[PDB]
Design a protein around this motif. Sequence first.
Motif, PDB file in Angstrom:
ATOM      1  N   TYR A  93       2.637  80.965 -52.421  1.00 51.46           N
ATOM      2  CA  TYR A  93       3.046  82.359 -52.212  1.00 51.46           C
ATOM      3  C   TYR A  93       3.254  82.661 -50.728  1.00 51.46           C
ATOM      4  O   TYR A  93       2.478  83.405 -50.124  1.00 51.46           O
ATOM      5  CB  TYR A  93       2.036  83.334 -52.847  1.00 51.46           C
ATOM      6  N   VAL A  94       4.302  82.071 -50.154  1.00 51.68           N
ATOM      7  CA  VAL A  94       4.565  82.166 -48.716  1.00 51.68           C
ATOM      8  C   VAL A  94       4.702  83.619 -48.252  1.00 51.68           C
ATOM      9  O   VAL A  94       4.387  83.932 -47.107  1.00 51.68           O
ATOM     10  CB  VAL A  94       5.812  81.348 -48.302  1.00 51.68           C
ATOM     11  N   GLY A  95       5.167  84.477 -49.161  1.00 53.69           N
ATOM     12  CA  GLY A  95       5.195  85.925 -48.997  1.00 53.69           C
ATOM     13  C   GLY A  95       5.456  86.454 -47.603  1.00 53.69           C
ATOM     14  O   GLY A  95       4.530  86.531 -46.797  1.00 53.69           O
ATOM     15  N   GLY A  96       6.711  86.824 -47.345  1.00 55.30           N
ATOM     16  CA  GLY A  96       7.181  87.320 -46.055  1.00 55.30           C
ATOM     17  C   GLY A  96       6.171  87.949 -45.107  1.00 55.30           C
ATOM     18  O   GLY A  96       5.929  87.425 -44.019  1.00 55.30           O
ATOM     19  N   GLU A  97       5.589  89.076 -45.508  1.00 49.52           N
ATOM     20  CA  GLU A  97       4.491  89.681 -44.754  1.00 49.52           C
ATOM     21  C   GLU A  97       3.656  90.580 -45.671  1.00 49.52           C
ATOM     22  O   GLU A  97       3.128  91.615 -45.252  1.00 49.52           O
ATOM     23  CB  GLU A  97       5.009  90.456 -43.536  1.00 49.52           C
ATOM     24  N   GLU A  98       3.538  90.158 -46.928  1.00 50.54           N
ATOM     25  CA  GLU A  98       2.851  90.930 -47.958  1.00 50.54           C
ATOM     26  C   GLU A  98       1.503  90.325 -48.357  1.00 50.54           C
ATOM     27  O   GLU A  98       0.586  91.048 -48.748  1.00 50.54           O
ATOM     28  CB  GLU A  98       3.744  91.087 -49.199  1.00 50.54           C
ATOM     29  N   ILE A  99       1.379  89.004 -48.249  1.00 49.29           N
ATOM     30  CA  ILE A  99       0.159  88.323 -48.678  1.00 49.29           C
ATOM     31  C   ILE A  99      -0.942  88.390 -47.608  1.00 49.29           C
ATOM     32  O   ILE A  99      -1.889  87.609 -47.635  1.00 49.29           O
ATOM     33  CB  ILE A  99       0.431  86.842 -49.091  1.00 49.29           C
ATOM     34  N   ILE A 100      -0.824  89.330 -46.673  1.00 57.03           N
ATOM     35  CA  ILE A 100      -1.873  89.527 -45.669  1.00 57.03           C
ATOM     36  C   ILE A 100      -2.953  90.512 -46.156  1.00 57.03           C
ATOM     37  O   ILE A 100      -4.111  90.440 -45.730  1.00 57.03           O
ATOM     38  CB  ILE A 100      -1.292  89.966 -44.289  1.00 57.03           C
ATOM     39  N   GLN A 101      -2.573  91.411 -47.065  1.00 56.17           N
ATOM     40  CA  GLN A 101      -3.495  92.398 -47.628  1.00 56.17           C
ATOM     41  C   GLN A 101      -4.283  91.851 -48.810  1.00 56.17           C
ATOM     42  O   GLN A 101      -5.456  92.183 -48.988  1.00 56.17           O
ATOM     43  CB  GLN A 101      -2.742  93.657 -48.058  1.00 56.17           C
ATOM     44  N   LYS A 102      -3.635  91.022 -49.623  1.00 52.56           N
ATOM     45  CA  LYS A 102      -4.334  90.359 -50.715  1.00 52.56           C
ATOM     46  C   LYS A 102      -5.256  89.245 -50.188  1.00 52.56           C
ATOM     47  O   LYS A 102      -6.120  88.755 -50.914  1.00 52.56           O
ATOM     48  CB  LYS A 102      -3.358  89.845 -51.785  1.00 52.56           C
ATOM     49  N   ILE A 103      -5.070  88.848 -48.928  1.00 53.37           N
ATOM     50  CA  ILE A 103      -6.092  88.071 -48.227  1.00 53.37           C
ATOM     51  C   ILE A 103      -7.142  89.051 -47.751  1.00 53.37           C
ATOM     52  O   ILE A 103      -8.342  88.837 -47.923  1.00 53.37           O
ATOM     53  CB  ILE A 103      -5.573  87.375 -46.958  1.00 53.37           C
ATOM     54  N   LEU A 104      -6.665  90.140 -47.151  1.00 57.96           N
ATOM     55  CA  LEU A 104      -7.528  91.206 -46.641  1.00 57.96           C
ATOM     56  C   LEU A 104      -8.365  91.895 -47.741  1.00 57.96           C
ATOM     57  O   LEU A 104      -9.095  92.852 -47.460  1.00 57.96           O
ATOM     58  CB  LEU A 104      -6.690  92.238 -45.858  1.00 57.96           C
ATOM     59  N   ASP A 105      -8.270  91.397 -48.977  1.00 61.92           N
ATOM     60  CA  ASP A 105      -9.017  91.963 -50.102  1.00 61.92           C
ATOM     61  C   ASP A 105      -8.995  91.105 -51.383  1.00 61.92           C
ATOM     62  O   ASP A 105      -9.955  90.397 -51.693  1.00 61.92           O
ATOM     63  CB  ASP A 105      -8.479  93.359 -50.423  1.00 61.92           C
ATOM     64  N   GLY A 106      -7.882  91.184 -52.114  1.00 58.55           N
ATOM     65  CA  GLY A 106      -7.769  90.661 -53.470  1.00 58.55           C
ATOM     66  C   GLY A 106      -8.021  89.181 -53.732  1.00 58.55           C
ATOM     67  O   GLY A 106      -9.077  88.821 -54.263  1.00 58.55           O
ATOM     68  N   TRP A 107      -7.052  88.330 -53.383  1.00 55.80           N
ATOM     69  CA  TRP A 107      -7.080  86.907 -53.760  1.00 55.80           C
ATOM     70  C   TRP A 107      -7.121  85.922 -52.585  1.00 55.80           C
ATOM     71  O   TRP A 107      -6.478  86.138 -51.556  1.00 55.80           O
ATOM     72  CB  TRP A 107      -5.887  86.568 -54.661  1.00 55.80           C
ATOM     73  N   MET A 108      -7.852  84.821 -52.763  1.00 56.09           N
ATOM     74  CA  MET A 108      -8.131  83.902 -51.657  1.00 56.09           C
ATOM     75  C   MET A 108      -7.716  82.435 -51.893  1.00 56.09           C
ATOM     76  O   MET A 108      -8.547  81.529 -51.771  1.00 56.09           O
ATOM     77  CB  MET A 108      -9.624  83.953 -51.300  1.00 56.09           C
ATOM     78  N   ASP A 109      -6.445  82.195 -52.210  1.00 50.39           N
ATOM     79  CA  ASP A 109      -5.956  80.828 -52.378  1.00 50.39           C
ATOM     80  C   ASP A 109      -5.292  80.351 -51.097  1.00 50.39           C
ATOM     81  O   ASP A 109      -4.067  80.447 -50.970  1.00 50.39           O
ATOM     82  CB  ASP A 109      -4.929  80.739 -53.509  1.00 50.39           C
ATOM     83  N   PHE A 110      -6.076  79.825 -50.156  1.00 47.10           N
ATOM     84  CA  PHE A 110      -5.506  79.435 -48.860  1.00 47.10           C
ATOM     85  C   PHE A 110      -6.256  78.414 -47.990  1.00 47.10           C
ATOM     86  O   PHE A 110      -7.264  77.817 -48.399  1.00 47.10           O
ATOM     87  CB  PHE A 110      -5.211  80.681 -48.009  1.00 47.10           C
TER      88      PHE A 110
END
Lengths: 228, 50, 93
Positions: A93-110
């Motif tokens: 989920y390379v996600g342009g600049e959206e997967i920073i909040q789901k790191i900042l909370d929701g999901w942690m696949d990284f």
Amino acid sequence: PKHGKRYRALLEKVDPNKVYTIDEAARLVKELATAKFDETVEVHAKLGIDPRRSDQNVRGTVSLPHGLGKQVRVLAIAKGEKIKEAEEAGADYVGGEEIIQKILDGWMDFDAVVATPDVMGAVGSKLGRILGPRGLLPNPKAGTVGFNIGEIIREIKAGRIEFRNDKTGAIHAPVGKASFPPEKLADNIRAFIRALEAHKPEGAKGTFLRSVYVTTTMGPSVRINPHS
Amino acid sequence: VRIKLLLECTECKRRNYATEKNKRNTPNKLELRKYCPWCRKHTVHREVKI
Amino acid sequence: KVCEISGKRPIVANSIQRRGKAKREGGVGKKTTGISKRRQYPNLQKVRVRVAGQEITFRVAASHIPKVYELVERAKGLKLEGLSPKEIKKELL
RNA sequence: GGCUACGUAGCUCAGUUGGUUAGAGCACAUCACUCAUAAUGAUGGGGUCACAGGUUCGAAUCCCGUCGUAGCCACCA
RNA sequence: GUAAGAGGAGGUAUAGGGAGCGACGCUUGCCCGGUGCCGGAAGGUCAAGGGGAGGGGUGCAAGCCCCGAACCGAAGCCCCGG
RNA sequence: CCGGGUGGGGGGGAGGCGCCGGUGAAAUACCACCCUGGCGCGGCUGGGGGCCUAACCCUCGGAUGGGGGGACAGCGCUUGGC
RNA sequence: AGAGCGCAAGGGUAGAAGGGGGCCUGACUGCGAGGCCUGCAAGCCGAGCAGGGGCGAAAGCCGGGCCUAGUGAACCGGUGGU
């Protein structure tokens, strides 16, 4: 209990004052490890770069002549376009600049984030408090400085190790993976010493190389005449 | 004069020289600008030493 | 005075400590130039071993006491007899 | 030059082997107790712990750069 | 006096050397900043000495020579008081 | 640090732990270096106390010696200082 | 032209030296005729020629600074280098 019972058997699997170099450890310590199934090696390398010496935490990113044997997923943050590149390598989920909040909370696949120069700023402003010091942030040299960083994501699927000094020189290089015969073990050991010098800092005195310990997951280590 | 300091310029790729001067107070760091080498042709030259 | 074994007597003037100030290497030199004059005495000592029947003293040099012990052993072989301090001590050496 | 040792509020010094929640007495303002001042008490004004990066998630608490300051040495074509 | 020794002294703290003023009488105040001077089992700094990390040069090389780091290094000045 | 840690033996027995999660900057069975300060032991090399006698230095009615100090003192080289 | 012309003074100055922006780094190297000045030694003037460049389409100027103060023979030695 105590040192474990196994590690009394391993109290005799070390003879607490030996060396066995890169080679006798490649083979005889292809054996010497005994626990689960990873036998890391942890090249545990201590020298004399000081906990700071003003500025000397090293950095050096290694990938070995082959590979380690893991997975990072990388997650990543890359304004749409950059994704494209990295989007034939390893990518979660390379996600342009959206997967920073789901790191900042929701999901942690990284692990890491590939960032870019651009979003370095961005991705360096938010979760910069834990990812850096723990070893996950951009840290513009830890596989996180562009779009050659998907090709460096393949440098990641090949390996990563960030040469450092902490307060003990320390460095801990993990391979051997239960089934790496004597070959791949010898090879990756020598390799890690190579690259160790390939990214080493200067200005500090003492003795570079020494505490080299090939310390497996749960087993033997006692140096290797730390070089040859 | 001193404390405003004076410096010589040096090429790249090893040696080539001239004899100039500096000034610190203006936010100046690496004094870098063109010149000519003894051997070959036009090059940069970086600020150096005494 | 003077050693009765290998001579050895005093040494003066530019025998020395000099002061100088001297040179070497600080930049232009230590301080660079530097120069002046002096004096130098030598050693000696006083050792008293009997040898034969009587007693004898010795105005020995520093590094030469074993020489006069060797003298004790050398004088053994000869005929020493009676009252002769410096006299028998003489024929010795 | 080598070397060290301090440099914090107007005055004067703590704390300084991190980790909070950065000060104390004298100086000044408001009040308070006071028959009335002094004494003491309770608040408030001011730090930008000399200057900048580096370590820490977090140094006034370490390294280093830079001056200002003192002891010693010793370099002054 | 270079020494041996000489005096001091065949004296011994009521004694011998040095300094200041100067019979007897009344009295000798206040400042230790600088300086000299009495003292202090910490310390700053500094000599030769010690140690030997790291290194240079040279030769097939064994080896030989040279440079010197950490810390160990006195009195002295500073420092603490009198 | 009053929060509890580490280490030793007696008893009795199949239970005792560990993990994202839950909590903060950081997790906690666990293999390896090192920092930290402390204990100890081997190398290297100084500090300080006390004894001893025969070098050394005095001293006693002719000493072969005894009596006092004693590795300090004095002397040679040398270090830096006043 | 009485202002600005960095800072004392004087000469000089818009038919620009001043003031704006773009570009750049000739605050070049190897020389250097012929001069100013002159007890020596110093200091001061500059086309030109080769290199290889900066500006401009060019013509062209550029070997610092509107000009005259902002300086120090030699010996000593540090410095990177052949």
